Design a binder for this molecule. Structure first.
Ligand SMILES: Nc1nc(NC2CC2)cc(-c2cccc(Cl)c2Cl)n1
Length: 154
């Protein structure tokens, strides 16, 4: 089994918008915006909705930039995460019950308080190189195996 999940990174020249998750799974980490994809909708439809609800932003075009499956040792279910880049948006970022948004300069991204994988795939996302990966975790904080390829090489 895989759980279908969406993640959106809103980017401007030199900076990325992240949100501090205030509750639930991954509470206390900065991340992009997203969540579960419901049965009967597309991955993209979920992403647009969840961005608006969590950050206040409406996006025109979402660019598909990555797909990573995550496995946790000792656990059955995988997370299938679909990652998008937004280069333009309407509205202004604002705190919601789920997320507190904040801009970070690209040389100041707080990787030590993000999911452990972000530091490894962020450079591909920032360079607009579409990618595919597979990560195996030992608990929430330790990466046992990480694999990443640009899809151009497959
Ligand atoms: N950056 C990043 N890294 C992740 N790494 C996997 C160890 C969990 C998972 C997620 C993610 C994406 C969408 C929704 C949810 Cl709930 C999550 Cl947790 N994001």
């Amino acid at each position: 089994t895989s759980k279908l999940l969406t993640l959106v990174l809103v980017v401007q020249p030199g900076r990325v918008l992240l949100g501090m998750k205030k509750r639930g799974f991954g509470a206390g980490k900065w991340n992009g915006f997203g969540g579960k994809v419901q049965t009967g909708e597309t991955i993209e439809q979920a992403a647009r909705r969840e961005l608006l609800e969590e950050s206040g932003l409406t996006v025109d075009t979402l660019h598909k930039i990555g797909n990573i499956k995550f496995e946790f040792i000792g656990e059955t279910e995988l997370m299938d995460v679909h990652i998008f880049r937004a280069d333009n948006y309407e509205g202004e970022p604002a705190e919601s019950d789920e997320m507190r948004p904040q801009w970070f300069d690209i040389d100041k991204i707080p990787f030590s308080q993000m999911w452990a994988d972000d530091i490894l795939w962020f450079p591909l996302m920032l360079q607009k190189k579409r990618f595919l990966g597979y990560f195996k975790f030992q608990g929430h904080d330790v990466i046992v195996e990480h694999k990443l390829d640009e899809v151009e090489d497959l």
